[model samples]
Target: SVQPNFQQDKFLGRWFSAGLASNSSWLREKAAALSMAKSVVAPATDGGLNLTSTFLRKNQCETRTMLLQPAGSLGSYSYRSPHWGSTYSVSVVETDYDQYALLYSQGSKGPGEDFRMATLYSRTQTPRAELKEKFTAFCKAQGFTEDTIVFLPQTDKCM
Candidate 1:
């Protein structure tokens, strides 16, 4: 149950991976090294938003496509990741309209199981601090703990 402003289609185009979700100190350090949003692309579709996110590390690339829908203005709709050879009906779990989101990989075969994979994407290279704060506050009102939310780096690189 969500509302659409029909503004999502305007966001269609390529974008960079600005941030990620990693609790591990080692992983966080690694993410920080490649913190800048490098080559990322997201296209808006009639049913959902499609993302092709890429991170540069070790002279290699990590990329994936994620489809997102409007869960509510409180958050966005969650859809399964089409890149991981998954058929278990996964979704992103969280969403927002203010230029941020939490992506999740839910194991559809089971209950109460999900993987928090990424975070904090914006419409621009650098999102305003006010918007970032507001987005987090919105997440909190929607029952999300800030300790679980993290920020990623944004880059100007486009491909």
Candidate 2:
């Protein structure tokens, strides 16, 4: 269940990763050095979203793509990792098309797989303070602690 009537056409484009929250132990290792990232969403045949996400790591660009296969509805989907064979379910919890899109994603494996991530995607270099505040609030309500949230630093490295 995502934003009602989520329009795919209006949602297709580049979005910036403004913030992130996750209970992942490894995320703690990377949060401090985390910088802004960008993702391109494009249409795919047979109802899938071809997602190209690029981020800067080690002062260079690292990119990856995952085919988001449509699931129960238009706003719901899942991705099975091509390299790892793992899978995850994803949903557009909310979005305003031009301003921001909030996403909730989780693991699709066995018990104690215990992974959920929420992120804020902005349509610009910087997101609104309101959205930043809401980002933490939403993540907080979902059982993430203060240390589990990070507002990635702004950068022009990856574009």
Candidate 3:
């Protein structure tokens, strides 16, 4: 189950992309090149959620904000990627409001198997030991191997 009666406002504020696990072939090819990213969540003007993300690479920072509509469930939301325009279903797998969160997103279905992107979010730049353990177990439960999971490295850049 995705979180039990998730409260969106409680999840608002700062978070970092501390870990990532995926099963796509593309993920494996670029896994070693991955780095930590940052995000800020806030309530939208209407009945939606806003996610402002920043990623830095090659000494440059790129920021993007996504307005995700609340889905018809307790802990689900929907949004499309800015560059790829692929609609994804975002789910809050678990969270403790102020510490860490496990977020899962599934892209639009295809003729073949769809893709799953699981993220470990932390209020700080690095994830706690228990957070990493839980994420590893979570990915393992989803059939993702150790090689495909990455506990992202620290970054001095901000956006």
Candidate 4:
């Protein structure tokens, strides 16, 4: 629930994945070496979001697209992922629109199948140290230890 002051317009744009935090072992292993990561958020006509994401895994670039519709309130969205067969609840935890953002997401397939993820995004591959520190604090507050938060590597190859 770390939403902004309700500035959806300003939040629309491309952001680079700078860091990530999670408790899921699968997520940690899969994203441990993500590269050339970027996510684009565009406004949909119905006041939702059109999300396009690109990243590199094993030297190959992969792309994904999804429609995120507003779920319960502002800054909260719901989307079903074909890859995971789960409906995700995404929330904009914090952001400045121009510098950095923190995103939180959770989903489940059934009882005891829940998973959660936290991402820190930046306008550039290298964000300010202060911003990174802020993201670290946020992750810690969410019960993630230092070992659970990982700083992602970036490359210009996918640009």
Task: In model 4, state the lDDT of residue 41.
Answer: 89
Model 1 lowest lDDT segment of ten: 109-118
RMSD of each: 5.3, 2.0, 2.3, 1.9
Please write out the lDDT profile of model 1 over residues 79-153, one tens digit for every residue: 543554442332334344346443433344333234334455565657678656755664565555655455665
Alpha-carbon shift of residue 141 in model 3 (angstroms): 0.7
Displacement of residue 100 (Cα, Å) in model 1 is: 6.2
| Residue 136 local lDDT, model 2 | 84
In model 3, where do residues sit more than 4 Å from their true spots? 27-34, 82-85, 109-113
Question: Could you tell me which residue pairs clash in candidate 2?
Answer: none
Residues 17-134 of candidate 3: C-alpha lDDT, one tens digit per residue: 7888887768644543545467889888867789897776555676778888887676688876655657788889899978899998888533222778788899988677888899
Indicate the TM-score of model 2. Answer: 0.89
Sort by TM-score, top down from the best? 4, 2, 3, 1
lDDT of each: 0.49, 0.81, 0.78, 0.83
- For residues 1-159, could you state the per-residue lDDT of candidate 4 as single tens digits? 857476888888988888889888777878876775678888887779998878888999888788988887788888777667678888888888889889998884533247778889898889999999989999999888989898887777766
| lDDT of predicted model 1 | 0.49
Report the C-alpha lDDT of model 2 over 55-103, residue by residue, as the tens digit: 7777877888878899877788887765445678888888989988888
TM-score of 4: 0.90
Over all chains combined, what TM-score does candidate 3 have? 0.87
Measured with C-alpha atoms, the lDDT of residue 109 in candidate 2 is 61
